[PDB]
Amino acid sequence: GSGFRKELVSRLLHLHFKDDKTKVSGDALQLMVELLKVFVVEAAVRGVRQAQAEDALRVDVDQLEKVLPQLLLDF
């Protein structure tokens, strides 16, 4: 399946570090590539379950908003 490129994740993390000396080990970077994936898939699948619980025909932003609060509390 698909996934985030290491170099994109690195750039996303570095966009936000307060300190220029902060670095990320190679293993830690690979783990964050997997973590971001699981975050996205969790959001999508939870959105699917909500839309189904509402007898809806597609996942709309209105279903996604109901799942986001527990999603962010888990992550």
Binding site: G1, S2, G3, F4, R5, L8, V9, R11, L12, L13, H14, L15, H16, F17, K18, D19, K21, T22, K23, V24, S25, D27, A28, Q30, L31, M32, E34, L35, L36, K37, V38, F39, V40, V41, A43, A44, V45, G47, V48, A51, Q52, L57, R58, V59, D60, V61, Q63, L64, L68, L72, L73, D74, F75
Partner: protein, 104 residues
């Protein structure tokens, strides 16, 4: 070639870089959502995918700040797998998954 003209050009460069980063996140989010949609036989709106992509971009901000803070807490400037395990400490589910992938 005034200071205010230079500041404007630098802001434009920061802005377009952020936008390119957001685009690249949106791309991959679209790919993951397409795999979910086929697997679950449930369609996503274009607005839903954009919302997930903006959420993933924001979540990176919180991941990065936490990681840096956890490394520094341990007097390290290099973020390691133990800092990443600390991100997942509230969810036993997520912690086992991350701990699994770390044994590789």
């Amino acid at each position: 070639g005034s200071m205010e003209e230079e500041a404007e050009t630098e802001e434009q460069q920061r802005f377009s870089y952020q936008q390119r980063l957001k685009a690249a996140v949106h791309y991959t989010v679209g790919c993951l959502c397409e795999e979910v949609a086929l697997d679950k036989e449930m369609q996503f709106s274009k607005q839903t995918i954009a919302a997930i992509s903006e959420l993933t971009f924001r979540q990176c901000e919180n991941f990065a700040k936490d990681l840096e803070m956890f490394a520094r807490h341990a007097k390290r400037t290099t973020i390691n797998t133990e800092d990443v395990k600390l991100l997942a400490r509230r969810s036993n589910s997520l912690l086992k998954y991350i701990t699994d992938k770390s044994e590789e």
